[PDB]
Symmetry: none
Subunit: 198 residues, 2 copies
């Protein structure tokens, strides 16, 4: 059966859990930061090279790295699709996913590290604050049709705004429409469901 | 149109160039290290954060991370396939690609850096020498003769071992024959003489 090794307040764990929810995969979610899951943590370090979090464990394999976890979930559960189904658009989305991973997701992890300086933290916060709206506008520009499903980029950008709040970083916009849209993302039923899954 | 920003004696450029050759992609390879076109190096530093080499550019994007370059090429040019068709094997290939990138590709580019002492260089060489056969055996263990991205990359690893005067640590006649067979692949030769 499907098992997801998670960790508390980890943007990557959260993203994969929401993906698994939308895909309708009935996965066992195990938080290895909890002392009762100590045995699952021991297993993780046997099946993975560095006890990587998150880890999606299938009957046939164990995967780590967000883009690889997504691809493995998509191979086994293609519906609803997380990426565009046409080559050009698919390529663009995967490149934009890499940009969001590098610019936001990796930096969110850095701000949560105990070995973080005052200089380093302000560099990261300034960086993410500068591009966040530009990236958000670019993700919605790619979408530019009712009862339709969400894409992996909208799903991930929602978690970026959620972690901005979590890290007490203000979302830099005065635009009423963008504010309404961000509030609409943060109130998506599957996002709430994932946030209250703990 | 498709534009590839390359640099002389760069393992990553070589790998992408061979992939684009096999795919039959109509890309415009530009060697930024050449003075002939300084105009392209300027445009590269605008579209990328640190003028990263290699960079696969399109009218819609610029990509410089190797695994993202390989995925973007596969999305646009799926034939011939560079990855296993079944999910388990696909997942394993991508993980093994990351291992090869970290253990060898990144270490080859460190040995080519100007500010590097002989002590640091010996650490890297011995490290790469220890795992090269184990990794090679693992790539062939994963495997009518359609080349996949891991075999393509491991070929360039053995090519750069020779290029950096690092001996391939094996006495095994079969492995030696196989490495020699990799290094004589027509598209590899074609890429090396491009």
């Amino acid at each position: 059966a499907m098992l997801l090794y998670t960790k508390k307040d980890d943007i990557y764990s959260d993203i994969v859990r929401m993906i698994l929810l939308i895909k309708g995969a009935n996965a066992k979610i195990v938080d290895v930061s909890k002392e009762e899951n100590s045995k699952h943590l021991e297993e993780l370090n046997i099946i993975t090279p560095n006890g990587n979090i998150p880890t999606l464990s299938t009957d046939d394999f164990a995967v780590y790295r967000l883009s690889v976890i997504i691809e493995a979930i998509e191979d086994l559960y293609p519906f609803p699709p997380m990426f565009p189904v046409f080559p050009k658009q698919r390529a663009n989305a995967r490149i934009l996913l890499e940009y969001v991973n590098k610019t936001f997701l990796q930096n969110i992890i850095k701000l949560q590290s105990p070995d973080l300086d005052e200089k380093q933290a302000n560099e990261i916060k300034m960086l993410m604050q500068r591009d966040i709206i530009s990236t958000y506008k670019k993700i919605v520009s790619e979408r530019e049709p009712d009862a339709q499903n969400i894409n992996v980029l909208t799903l991930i950008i929602t978690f970026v705004f959620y972690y901005f709040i979590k890290l007490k970083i203000s979302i830099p916009t005065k635009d009423k429409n963008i504010i309404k849209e961000i509030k609409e993302l943060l109130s998506e039923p599957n996002f709430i469901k994932t946030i209250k899954a703990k």
